[PDB]
Design a protein around this motif. Structure first.
Motif, PDB file in Angstrom:
ATOM      1  N   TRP A 100      26.447 -22.190 -17.655  1.00 27.74           N
ATOM      2  CA  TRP A 100      27.768 -22.747 -18.005  1.00 27.74           C
ATOM      3  C   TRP A 100      28.305 -23.633 -16.856  1.00 27.74           C
ATOM      4  O   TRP A 100      28.563 -24.840 -17.092  1.00 27.74           O
ATOM      5  CB  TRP A 100      28.733 -21.603 -18.386  1.00 27.74           C
ATOM      6  CG  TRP A 100      30.026 -22.153 -18.911  1.00 27.74           C
ATOM      7  CD1 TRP A 100      31.149 -22.438 -18.182  1.00 27.74           C
ATOM      8  CD2 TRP A 100      30.293 -22.614 -20.250  1.00 27.74           C
ATOM      9  NE1 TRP A 100      32.104 -23.015 -18.977  1.00 27.74           N
ATOM     10  CE2 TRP A 100      31.606 -23.148 -20.249  1.00 27.74           C
ATOM     11  CE3 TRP A 100      29.571 -22.610 -21.450  1.00 27.74           C
ATOM     12  CZ2 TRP A 100      32.204 -23.655 -21.405  1.00 27.74           C
ATOM     13  CZ3 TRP A 100      30.167 -23.090 -22.601  1.00 27.74           C
ATOM     14  CH2 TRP A 100      31.459 -23.625 -22.571  1.00 27.74           C
ATOM     15  N   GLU A 101      28.480 -23.067 -15.654  1.00 26.50           N
ATOM     16  CA  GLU A 101      29.160 -23.759 -14.517  1.00 26.50           C
ATOM     17  C   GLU A 101      28.405 -25.026 -14.125  1.00 26.50           C
ATOM     18  O   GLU A 101      29.078 -26.018 -13.862  1.00 26.50           O
ATOM     19  CB  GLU A 101      29.318 -22.818 -13.326  1.00 26.50           C
ATOM     20  CG  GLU A 101      30.468 -21.836 -13.517  1.00 26.50           C
ATOM     21  CD  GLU A 101      30.362 -20.598 -12.652  1.00 26.50           C
ATOM     22  OE1 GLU A 101      29.398 -20.539 -11.846  1.00 26.50           O
ATOM     23  OE2 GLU A 101      31.267 -19.707 -12.750  1.00 26.50           O
ATOM     24  N   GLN A 102      27.074 -25.026 -14.150  1.00 27.69           N
ATOM     25  CA  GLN A 102      26.260 -26.212 -13.762  1.00 27.69           C
ATOM     26  C   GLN A 102      26.076 -27.196 -14.936  1.00 27.69           C
ATOM     27  O   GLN A 102      25.349 -28.186 -14.739  1.00 27.69           O
ATOM     28  CB  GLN A 102      24.902 -25.728 -13.212  1.00 27.69           C
ATOM     29  CG  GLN A 102      25.052 -24.748 -12.024  1.00 27.69           C
ATOM     30  CD  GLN A 102      25.849 -25.373 -10.889  1.00 27.69           C
ATOM     31  OE1 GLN A 102      25.562 -26.480 -10.452  1.00 27.69           O
ATOM     32  NE2 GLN A 102      26.863 -24.681 -10.399  1.00 27.69           N
ATOM     33  N   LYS A 103      26.584 -26.902 -16.143  1.00 24.60           N
ATOM     34  CA  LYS A 103      26.503 -27.806 -17.333  1.00 24.60           C
ATOM     35  C   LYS A 103      25.075 -28.105 -17.748  1.00 24.60           C
ATOM     36  O   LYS A 103      24.821 -29.217 -18.208  1.00 24.60           O
ATOM     37  CB  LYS A 103      27.217 -29.129 -17.024  1.00 24.60           C
ATOM     38  CG  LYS A 103      28.711 -28.952 -16.716  1.00 24.60           C
ATOM     39  CD  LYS A 103      29.435 -30.271 -16.454  1.00 24.60           C
ATOM     40  CE  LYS A 103      30.945 -30.191 -16.572  1.00 24.60           C
ATOM     41  NZ  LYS A 103      31.512 -29.012 -15.863  1.00 24.60           N
ATOM     42  N   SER A 104      24.150 -27.176 -17.524  1.00 23.28           N
ATOM     43  CA  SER A 104      22.754 -27.340 -17.959  1.00 23.28           C
ATOM     44  C   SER A 104      22.694 -27.418 -19.505  1.00 23.28           C
ATOM     45  O   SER A 104      23.547 -26.815 -20.170  1.00 23.28           O
ATOM     46  CB  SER A 104      21.908 -26.198 -17.420  1.00 23.28           C
ATOM     47  OG  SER A 104      22.029 -26.061 -16.008  1.00 23.28           O
ATOM     48  N   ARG A 105      21.748 -28.195 -20.002  1.00 26.79           N
ATOM     49  CA  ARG A 105      21.403 -28.426 -21.420  1.00 26.79           C
ATOM     50  C   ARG A 105      20.210 -27.533 -21.809  1.00 26.79           C
ATOM     51  O   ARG A 105      20.145 -27.138 -22.979  1.00 26.79           O
ATOM     52  CB  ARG A 105      21.026 -29.908 -21.620  1.00 26.79           C
ATOM     53  CG  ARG A 105      20.545 -30.253 -23.032  1.00 26.79           C
ATOM     54  CD  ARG A 105      21.734 -30.328 -23.965  1.00 26.79           C
ATOM     55  NE  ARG A 105      21.450 -30.169 -25.380  1.00 26.79           N
ATOM     56  CZ  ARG A 105      20.661 -30.957 -26.082  1.00 26.79           C
ATOM     57  NH1 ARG A 105      20.039 -31.976 -25.495  1.00 26.79           N
ATOM     58  NH2 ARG A 105      20.509 -30.724 -27.377  1.00 26.79           N
TER      59      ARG A 105
END
Ligand SMILES: CCCC(=O)Nc1nnn(CC)n1
Length: 284
Positions: A100-105
């Motif tokens: 979530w925090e790192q915005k990974s796909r």
């Protein structure tokens, strides 16, 4: 020196063990003080595998910001990866907090939950549409949306929901389910095929946060995945692709996480993947 020739020269001489030890000898050493704090002992799967303080991922909470995860930033290739260990029973919530925090796909998983009759990582995703997972410690909800199971790997569509804000994101789970329990694959064909599928999804692309990649420790198979990707990208970008030195790329990557590539067989397999991938792509 063209790596294909260097390859045959090491193979004919059978010096893979001697190359591999040279890398181990020259590899960076940096402090891992946060990882070794006593409060973090049950956040670590292996006592000899720790993220460096300078490159570790921090969780966005005041309590305890620690996870066994490292940001590998490859400046010339313009790619970032997060390499992490297989989640533990008590770090499954931290894992999804980091995604979530790192915005990974995308999440890339290179190990089966059980190998050699022991548990290699927690069952950290839902196996049935109608049985979602809730991580109460990090206030996240995870739901299986769909599953596409093929011979060498499975792709899952997941929905991750921040129960605090009710935002939702689509996460793709790329699961390489066919890495053998001992040694390395005999052909890199299916590993390269799986890498092209991850690329195709846009999970490795700069419009998202870095991809999260893991095996059991997050250094062996995880090492092989990001070394091959970065080496092929550099062979695309540069005017002379025979200039790309896989040993130099590995030592650069080892400045960010310790132990990347765990055996001389994994080093050899890395060469084979890049040599084979370079072809194919080269006009097809
Ligand atoms: C290679 C295809 C995937 C697979 O089932 N691997 C596996 N499972 N146990 N082993 C023992 C060496 N190897």
């Amino acid at each position: 020196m063209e790596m294909e020739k260097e390859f045959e020269q090491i193979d004919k001489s059978g010096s893979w063990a001697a190359i591999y030890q040279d890398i181990r000898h020259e590899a960076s050493d940096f402090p891992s003080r946060v990882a070794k704090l006593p409060k973090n002992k049950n956040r670590n799967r292996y006592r000899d595998v720790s993220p460096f303080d300078h490159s570790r991922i921090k969780l966005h909470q005041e309590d305890n910001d620690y996870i066994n995860a490292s940001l590998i930033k490859m400046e010339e290739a313009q790619r970032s990866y997060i390499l992490t260990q297989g989640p533990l029973p008590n770090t499954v919530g931290h894992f999804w907090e980091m995604v979530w925090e790192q915005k990974s796909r995308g999440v890339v998983m290179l190990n089966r939950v059980m190998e050699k009759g022991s548990l290699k990582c927690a069952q950290y995703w839902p196996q049935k549409e109608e049985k979602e997972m809730i991580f109460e410690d990090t206030n996240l909800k995870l739901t299986l949306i769909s599953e596409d199971i093929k011979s060498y790997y499975t792709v899952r569509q997941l929905e991750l929901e921040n129960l605090t804000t009710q935002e939702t994101r689509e996460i793709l789970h790329f699961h390489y389910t066919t890495w053998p329990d001992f040694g390395v694959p005999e052909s890199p064909a299916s590993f390269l095929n799986f890498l092209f599928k991850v690329r195709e999804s846009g999970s490795l692309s700069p419009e998202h946060g870095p991809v999260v990649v893991h095996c059991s420790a997050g250094i062996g198979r995880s090492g092989t995945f990001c070394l091959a990707d970065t080496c092929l990208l550099l062979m695309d970008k540069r005017k002379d692709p025979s200039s790309v030195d896989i040993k130099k790329v590995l030592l650069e990557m080892r400045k960010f996480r310790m132990g990347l590539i765990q055996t001389a067989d994994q080093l050899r397999f890395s060469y084979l993947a890049v040599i084979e991938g370079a072809k194919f792509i080269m006009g097809d």
